[PDB]
Amino acid sequence: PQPSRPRKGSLGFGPRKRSTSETPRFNSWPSDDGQPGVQGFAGYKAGMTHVVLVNDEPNSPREGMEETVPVTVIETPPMRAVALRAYEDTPYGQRPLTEVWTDEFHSELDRTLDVPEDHDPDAAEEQIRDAHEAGDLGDLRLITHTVPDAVPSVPKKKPDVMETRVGGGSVSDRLDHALDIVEDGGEHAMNDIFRAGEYADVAGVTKGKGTQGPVKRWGVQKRKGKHARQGWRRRIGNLGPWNPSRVRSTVPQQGQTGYHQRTELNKRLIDIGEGDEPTVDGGFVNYGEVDGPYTLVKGSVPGPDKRLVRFRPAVRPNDQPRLDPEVRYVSNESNQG
Template sequence: VTAEAWKGTDHPALLRRMPHHAESSPEELDRFRSAPGDEVRLILHTQPEHVYAVGEKVGRLFEVRVAGEKIEERKAFALERLGTELSVDQLAKEGEFVDVLGVTKGFGFQGHIQRWGVKLQPRKNSKHRRMIGTLGPHNPSFVTYRIPQAGQQGYHRRTQFNLRVLKVVPDPRTDPITPAGGFPNYGEVRSGCLILHGSLPGPPSG
């Protein structure tokens, strides 16, 4: 890190996850503009209080890289958005392709059959039907990673690549998209959102 620029805030999502930083002075902002480097990053946090049907109470803190051709343009973009609220229409446009990061639906500790879908053992040929037939050959004398075994299923971080943005909805109150009766397992969309072509990792209300 060669230079930093901060905006003073008292939002609980930031105060609970990181130490408080005072607002940067004009001299520090000038130092940020003239600092060497080829990458600019923003520290953002979510606002779950504005999203309906999500059980989170404290926003998530994450870091995002600012893309662009020239480093001066990226620094100017970061300083303009410093301390402001980003809406969905500033993140993507209709027809673009985006990558979505998410956490898959968790199922806890599961056995061989549920986790990998292997075949049940014959009823008269095994004391344990819901197990695999062998852990592998004598040589090599260890269990390889290809052997299906019991363990954690789901709740993994995954990235879905190249999803086309079909529609950008900054305000559903002026452009309602919720069908009659609401979306299954979610309800009514009350905040800005993106409509993507494809599936996303995680539960419907995540």
């Protein structure tokens, strides 16, 4: 009767085309519960090493015992929240009302931007407050960006700009919290929003695979037995039935594989730090030597070394936070063995 089988590959991440902005753009931000705060930070994937910890799980019998855990190194130097964007609530969702900027910019922000010369912060700010006064202020996000220049391993100086939502406090309170941050230089570190032990959401653009066949792309079988010698090996059975007299867009086909945005959930921040503590002997292969601001994110992270990864407090956490896990050992062992 022909046994059952789930279709090959998932339909959720479609179409499987190359991404528009290599810089991830979250499409969902955390809820407003705590104090006013920015809802995410970003960095650059460095490489992988393992670490030994002390089991935090109060339920696991292993609780208290050492345990070897893999970790992706991500250099996360200080970013600069260069502006504050306001959204007005209109009959057609949210729309950018107005932004508030600064004076002190990063020496090389003009490599990507058309840096302001004459902005009227106080006035623009007024617009926001009058809109809040009217009861039309939606959510408050801060135009942000990185200092790629800070990271040596990364060749790019030309900064990666991305907006991030701010929440937590009451509209008014967080609004001010925003301005406060911005009304300086916008400098902030990962510890300004995270703490080791907290589960985050790392989003990134996958590794570049170019065009690939159905087998690799949609995980379809290869021709089997005798069927793999007649002149067909990685080609599928057919593109559909007689009728519908067409090719349904749900049949696994050759195409662009990789370079897609992915938002990898519940990534636990195993340790936030600064220095050369996670670096490897010889240097992180095809990256370099780490020294300074960073994060040790548990497990894999979407993307290749040098790619901009983005963090965010877990929108859908499953377990309870175990702040600051006891990190006994971090591997310095070479990655060329």
